[PDB]
Amino acid sequence: HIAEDADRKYEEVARKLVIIESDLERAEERAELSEGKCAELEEELKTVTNNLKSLEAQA
């Protein structure tokens, strides 16, 4: 009884582990994609800062 109980509940534990691992891989993709997009965004911001400072000097 106790052995099969542990068996079933901990196989379900392994199922929740599959879920958590899937979502962890998803979150790694999310993090890497977001940091790449935001490195692009920081390129945009540094460029536009250069633009504004140069152009306001001219102004």
Partner: protein, 519 residues
């Protein structure tokens, strides 16, 4: 040879004389100073006698800023001590010397081979007066040079010795070119003097490591550490776009040094830009500006260099020691002396402070001697202490409102500069002390900022840059990284409920320890 009250003045003759060899002149055994001619052999023998009749260690303080005369005298006194109380200690001592020559000597404005530390050679003696092993002990070392050198000077020889491209094996291992003007930690003043080669001295240091107990690893590791100390000098950081934060731009020297010392590159950059701290029971990132990162880099370089130096001296003590448990020894103290240059700065101030301390020590000794002699002849005559009450007032530099405490305060205070430092100095001392005086700055000569009335005259100091030179913030995150390095020499160095560190404070503590030993 001459006697001066209690000193023993020797002049370099520059002409070979049998006045030391052979032992025909060494007949001073048993003889006293007051009867025999005035030779340093008499003093060595007197120290021997005093050790045998008093069981109290003896000390020999030899003047060291003189280029010659001191070294030959050290050789002659160790030879004499081997002779009287007889792979020898003299051979052994002079074998591993190239290590110290390359590590603790640098091109000075008024020299070209300058002892930039304190060498306290202990020749130990048996229970009865038999020669035992002899260990070397080093004291306060001018570590500020490892990063900053004045114009028309350069740091310790070993850097240019290595960078003379003598062993392309090394300059191939340390990912390092040969042009000295590419490394800011060495290209500050002048890269080389014409009064010495670097290749043959590199060979001498190699042979020193060989005669030393060092293996192949205990030598490649040292070369790697010196290469890393050079690679630190040209790491670059920039304020993050639009807020404040220091971040790295380009990691070339980063990867170089990371591979050399045996660390990670991203981990090192993160620990340099994001140092962690323990708040009670938790860790929190601390922010770092660019100047803070640079100060931390310099502090790391200085700490590494001093640790390596001390470890090498311990290795010399090990390879040069094998003897029965002995009791007593004689102290041979080599150290720089007082300085009065045309442009005095922080280092000169520290050196003059140490010499003020030593001179007060000598004055106390001579005072108690004269007072004893007066109580001996029944001559009733008492006077204010001739030992300390002369310089104890020229010890502003240590009392907790003098120059050093003010400099530390200014190192802590926000937005402090050299002008504010000068203002504070003036408000606390100008007019309220007699030894503190305003310099007589005449147009046509270098500008001073204040003048101290030392025992050896009134010296004029120029405080420009003391703030950056006194800061010493150690980055404990990077030290923890060091403690995990693969390069076993680095881990041995850094084996052993912080941002307040200053060069002056460590210097004062070291000087206190040295005086405690001598007293």
């Amino acid at each position: 040879y001459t006697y001066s009250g209690l000193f023993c003045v020797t002049v370099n003759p520059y002409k070979w004389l049998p006045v030391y060899n052979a032992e025909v002149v060494a007949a001073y055994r048993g003889k006293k100073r007051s009867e025999a001619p005035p030779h340093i052999f008499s003093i060595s023998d007197n120290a021997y006698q005093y050790m045998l009749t008093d069981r109290e260690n003896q000390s020999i303080l030899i003047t060291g800023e003189s280029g010659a005369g001191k070294t030959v005298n050290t050789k002659r006194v160790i030879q004499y001590f081997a002779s009287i109380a007889a792979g020898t200690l003299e051979d052994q001592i002079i074998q591993a010397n190239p290590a110290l020559e390359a590590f603790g000597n640098a091109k000075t404005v008024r020299n070209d081979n300058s002892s930039r530390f304190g060498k306290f050679i202990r020749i130990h003696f048996g229970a009865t007066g038999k020669l035992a092993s002899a260990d070397i002990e080093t004291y306060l070392l001018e570590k500020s040079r490892v990063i900053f050198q004045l114009k028309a000077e350069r740091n310790y020889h070993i850097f240019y010795q290595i960078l003379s491209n003598k062993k392309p094996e090394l300059l191939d291992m340390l990912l390092v070119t040969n042009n000295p003007y590419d490394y800011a930690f060495v290209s500050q003043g002048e890269v080389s003097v014409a009064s010495i080669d670097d290749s043959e001295e590199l060979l001498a240091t190699d042979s020193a490591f060989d005669v030393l107990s060092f293996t192949a690893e205990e030598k490649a590791g040292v070369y790697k550490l010196t290469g890393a100390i050079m690679h630190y000098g040209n790491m670059k950081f920039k304020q993050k776009q639009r807020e404040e934060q220091a971040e790295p731009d380009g990691t070339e020297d980063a990867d170089k040094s990371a591979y050399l010392m045996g660390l990670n590159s991203a981990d090192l950059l993160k620990g340099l830009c994001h140092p962690q701290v323990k708040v009670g029971n938790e860790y929190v990132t601390k922010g770092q500006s660019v100047q803070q990162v640079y100060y931390s880099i310099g502090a790391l370089a200085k700490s590494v260099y001093e640790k390596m130096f001390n470890w090498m001296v311990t290795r010399i003590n090990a390879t040069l020691e094998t003897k029965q448990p002995r009791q007593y020894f004689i102290g041979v103290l080599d150290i720089a002396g007082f300085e009065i240059f045309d442009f005095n700065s922080f280092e000169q101030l520290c050196i003059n402070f140490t010499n003020e301390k030593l001179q007060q020590f000598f004055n106390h000794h001579m005072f108690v001697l004269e007072q004893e002699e007066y109580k001996k002849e029944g001559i009733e005559w008492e006077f204010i202490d001739f030992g300390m009450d002369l310089q104890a007032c020229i010890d502003l530099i240590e009392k907790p409102m003098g120059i050093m405490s003010i400099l530390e305060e200014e190192c802590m205070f926000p937005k402090a500069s050299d002008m504010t430092f000068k203002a504070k100095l003036y408000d606390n001392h100008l007019g309220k002390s007699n030894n503190f005086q305003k310099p007589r700055n005449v147009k046509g000569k270098q500008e001073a900022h204040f003048s101290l009335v030392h025992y050896a005259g009134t010296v004029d100091y120029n405080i420009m840059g003391w703030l950056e030179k006194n800061k010493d913030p150690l980055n404990e995150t990077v030290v923890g990284l060091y403690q995990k390095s693969s390069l076993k020499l680095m881990a041995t160095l850094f084996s052993t409920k912080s941002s307040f560190q200053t060069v002056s404070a460590l210097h004062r503590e070291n000087l206190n320890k040295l005086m405690t030993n001598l007293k």
